[PDB]
Amino acid sequence: MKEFYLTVEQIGDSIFERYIDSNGRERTREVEYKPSLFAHCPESQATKYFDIYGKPCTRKLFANMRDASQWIKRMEDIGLEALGMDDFKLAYLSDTYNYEIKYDHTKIRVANFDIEVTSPDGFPEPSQAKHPIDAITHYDSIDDRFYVFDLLNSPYGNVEEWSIEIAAKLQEQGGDEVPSEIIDKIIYMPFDNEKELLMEYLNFWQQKTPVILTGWNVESFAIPYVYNRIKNIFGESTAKRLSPHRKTRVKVIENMYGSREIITLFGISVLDYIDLYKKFSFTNQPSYSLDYISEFELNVGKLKYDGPISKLRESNHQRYISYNIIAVYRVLQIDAKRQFINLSLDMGYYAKIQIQSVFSPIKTWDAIIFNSLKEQNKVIPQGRSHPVQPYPGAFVKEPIPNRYKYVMSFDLTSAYPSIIRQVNISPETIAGTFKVAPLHDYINAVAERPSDVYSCSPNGMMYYKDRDGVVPTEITKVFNQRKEHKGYMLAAQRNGEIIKEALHNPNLSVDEPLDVDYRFDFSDEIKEKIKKLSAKSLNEMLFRAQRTEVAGMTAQINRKALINGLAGALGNVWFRYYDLRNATAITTFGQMALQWIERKVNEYLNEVCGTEGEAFVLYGDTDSIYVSADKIIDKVGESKFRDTNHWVDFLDKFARERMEPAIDRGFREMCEYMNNKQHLMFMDREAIAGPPLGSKGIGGFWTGKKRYALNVWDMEGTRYAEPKLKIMGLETQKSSTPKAVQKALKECIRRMLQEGEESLQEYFKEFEKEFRQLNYISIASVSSANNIAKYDVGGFPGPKCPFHIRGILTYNRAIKGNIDAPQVVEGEKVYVLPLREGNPFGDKCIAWPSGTEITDLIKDDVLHWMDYTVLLEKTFIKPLEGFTSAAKLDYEKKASLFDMF
DNA sequence: ATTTAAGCAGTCCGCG
DNA sequence: GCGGACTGCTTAG
Ligand SMILES: [Ca+2]
Ligand SMILES: [Ca+2]
Ligand SMILES: [Ca+2]
Ligand SMILES: [Ca+2]
Ligand SMILES: [Ca+2]
């Protein structure tokens, strides 16, 4: 096999590299890497190296890496550009792996671990590590085994061995229900003292040194706790054995308001799963506890135990250890679904970076672009300092708030990346500038053509047309990958809808799910077999289809995020290719494109309807248009349609056969107007939306910018078995809105769009009557909690104190003295409830850590003093009044003349 | 650890 | 009450 790196580090004048050799074995080497950097040189000096602008360079080969870094410094003192890759490990990887990396994940040791620490005095601080580590579960991907290190004797209690037999048993048997599929994979090791446990753990670690290290909060808790605990017991040299090169650094992570410390383990790539989830999931969750996320992702029940975690080991060590093992498995189950580890490996190896660098789109693109240029013997420019400056973004149309009955939407495929490619936007393709006219002059095609030579953006920038820039070339490569995976995602989605339809008529038989590839549209033969399957088999196929869709989603959406991040990175001051001219060329062209095509679509539809000055485009955001289709439907007449699917078909055909060609013509004209390199504005139909045929549903409504709901029958070619709401911006979509309220508001919207005013009124009346029975957590608001200390004046709210911070201060006073009650963590999320006047907490609200039950000492009082009236008004009635007034609809029946009967 | 536009909740205080 | 200036938070692109 071709060789591939696992990890790379610079330590002084040495590169330390762990890798898989040509025979598939893991090896480690130290290499005295001599890096090269570059200086500009005279034109008369023969060279094969040129900077990105075609200026000649001489290569400087240094005796060692420190000499290279010192030369960069003196080049600054002199005032001259020091060109080349200044991150020497990336240069090392580029030299060592000068081919597309084919990696074999089965050879990469992925370790998933979790530790337990009993603490009788509150949260066990990793920097102090003053309590024994009493359990470690460590899953190894190569062995496919869970290694369980169990402390039997501690200052906080001596316990019996954990029993695998009880662990396997059902909860209803008094067992812990450790999943049967992992029972045979557990290797259990009890220890009668912590020193032996830790010494053995470290010997184990040397034998099975993780390459990828993950778990839940491992970077902020487990890793630093283990490091510091070992350090405190044995000394630093022993703790550094967690690094394969015996090198560690205390790294300070600094944000807006304060800082924290992590331990960098040289020669390990730490990918904390919480951080993977936050970057790659595109969710915003009310809580990031593993219990909460596991429930959300996998629909598994919360790990239940009696009493506080600080007494769980002494009271029920059996359950204590089982839940430690399950916790490790939950993360593996989440990854089986989401495939974020696979994603990181794919992207890391593609870019030729340390895998953990996938968290930095700047690092990722810096590496991609460096490798690309190096291939042509080109030399990257030196990074420079820039002051942070604001720059303009997208255009968003102000909608008239209203119901909108029939709607077809369209938006650009990969808008900003397509703009970069079309215009040829790149550091080295800048050709000059032209004299800019007001944007609206371009939108209306009245401005003088910017250039007859170069490719233009309406911000004034001109680009070469003779050759693609490195930014367009590299963005296209990742775009193509994105497109492939999106194809798989949408096939899986369409396949899912076939199964859902079949589920209406399940056969009464005993059979098996069909062995199929859900990434490809089901063949006719597969469809026939499906119509004969049982519900059991169909449900299993549906689950498999949806898992395949999730896999495709992960792969496509994060590739989308990477390419969009490149357009973004052009406006980040730390990016090597930072240029506000290029960042703004993209956004300004985008503004023009949207408003240009709005004009073209209005003109086209006014033509085919024989009207003048009518606005068919009702809304648009960045790269999208929403077109009112009422007149199209009305031209044939609702009576002519057999059912809902019939008019959906008709609108689908109209969009594909009339609208899209008109849109394409409009954009081809714009490309010529701007003299662009290549026509790449492809605005495909997104949604077909409307009420069910014959119903009183309103179809859709807008309240304002970035706030709307549509009843969608077909999305990007997926024809739903059941209509699906596309709701953007409204309170149903916000993590801050209570769970039960999101749910009730969604049902109000469903009823508005599908059933009409009367149905909405029936539901509102019921919700208003019953809501006080809802569980307090379900009706609690949610907020991030920053700057708690800033607004805390002797335990009371200072000036301008935010509502949620006031709640936290109330909580703090209410739990005062207790070291055992959960503390609110700065920067994390809280649940918030309003409190009735004259409550014993002495303020108008209370807040506590999200994803948790409020501590028992105050739970009863919070429940007694919860202000349901305020809660209902703020979270439910106020937003509903917004939805209904915009839709010109009443949520309560108005009096009429009929009342007199 | 890429980016801008823009929404709503709430505080403070004005608004004769 | 409602608006604007402002902070805080969160979502649509
Ligand atoms: Ca735990
Ligand atoms: Ca788009
Ligand atoms: Ca059937
Ligand atoms: Ca869009
Ligand atoms: Ca599309």
Centre of ligand 5 from the C-alpha of residue A666, in Å? 18
Look up residue A242 and give its DSSP letter. G
Domain, as residue range, for A858 = 775-866
Are A652 and A715 in the same domain? Answer: yes
Do residues A653 and A635 share a domain? yes
Most distant CA pair in chain A: distance in Å?
103
- Do both A795 and A694 map to the same domain? no
Tokens of A369: 């672009």
CATH number at residue A158: 3.30.420.10
Q: From the CA of A529, which ligand is nearest?
A: 3
Determine phi and psi for A560, rounding to 5 degrees: -55, -45
Amino acid at A754: Q
In this structure, is residue A252 part of a structural domain?
yes
Residues A289, A152 share a domain: yes
CATH number at residue A878: 1.20.1280.300
Is A140 within a domain?
A: yes
Residue A556: which H helix or E strand, with range?
helix A535-569
Asked if residue A415 is part of any domain, the answer here is yes
Q: Give A29's strand partners.
A: A17
Distances (CA, A) of A38 to A52, A60, A75, A362, A374: 12, 6, 11, 22, 12
A199 and A304: one domain?
yes
- The total number of structural domains in chain A stands at 6
Contact A515, A533 (CB under 8 A): no
Same structural domain, A811 and A859: yes
- In which region does residue A708 sit, left (phi positive, over 0), alpha (psi from -120 to 50) or beta (all else)? beta
Q: Domain with A2 in it: what CATH number?
A: 3.30.342.10
Tell whether A274 and A158 lie within a shared domain. yes
Q: Residue A623, CB, less than 7 Å from strand C?
A: yes
Q: Are A233 and A194 in contact (CB under 8 A)?
A: yes
Residues A671 and A770 in one domain: no
Residue with tokens 């042509």: A376
In-domain check, residue A141: yes
The Å distance, CA of A478 to C1' of B6, is 30
List the A455-456 sheet strands across, edge first. A430-433, A461-463, A455-456
Distance between Cα A551 and ligand 5 center (Å):
19
**Is there contact between A829 and strand C, defined as CB under 7 Å from any strand atom?**
yes
Are A598 and A461 in the same domain?
A: yes
Residue A898 lies in a domain: no
Which ligand does the CA of A119 lie closest to?
1
- Which structural technique was applied? X-ray
Q: Do A806 and A787 share a domain, yes or no?
A: yes
Chain B nucleotides reached by a protein CB under 7 Å? 1-12
Q: Where among A556, A572, A588 does a domain terminate?
A: A572
- Nearest CA to A281 out of A303, A296, A263, A260 is that of A296
Helices (H), A286-378: 290-298, 312-338, 340-351, 361-374
- The answer as to whether A896 is a domain residue is no
Q: Apex CA A170: angle with CA A166 and CA A173, to 5°?
A: 70
Q: Which helix (H) or strand (E) holds A265?
A: strand A259-265
Chain center to CA of A548: 18
Domain-ending residue, one of A382, A405, A434: A382
Give the residue from A323, A355, A382 where a domain finishes: A382
Q: How far is the CA of A106 from the C1' of C11 (A)?
A: 39
Pairing relationship of beta strands A133-140 and A683-689 according to DSSP bridges: unpaired
User: Which residues are within 8 A (CB) of A9 and not within 5 positions of it... i.e. 6 or more apart?
Assistant: A15, A16, A17, A89, A245, A247, A266, A267
| Under 8 Å between Cβ of A102 and A2 | yes
Beta carbon of A782 within 7 Å of strand C? yes
Per-residue burial over A772-810, b if 16 or more Cβ lie within 10 Å, else e, is eebebbebbbbbebbebeebbeeeebeeebbebbbbbbb
The answer on A306 and A396 residing in a single domain is no
Cα dist from A685 to A11, A275, A624, whole Å: 53, 34, 10
Q: Cα Rg for chain A, rounded, in angstroms?
A: 31
Candidates A896, A889, A863, A870; CA nearest to A764 is: A889
Residues A197, A191 contacting (CB under 8 angstroms): yes
**Overall resolution, Å:** 1.9
Position A899 in a domain: no
User: Which of the nucleotides in strand C have any atom less than 7 Å away from a protein CB atom?
Assistant: 7-13
Same domain flag for A227 and A320: yes
User: Any idea what the CATH number is for the domain that residue A856 is in?
Assistant: 3.40.1820.10
Distance from C-alpha of A790 to C-alpha of A811, rounded to nearest angstrom: 16
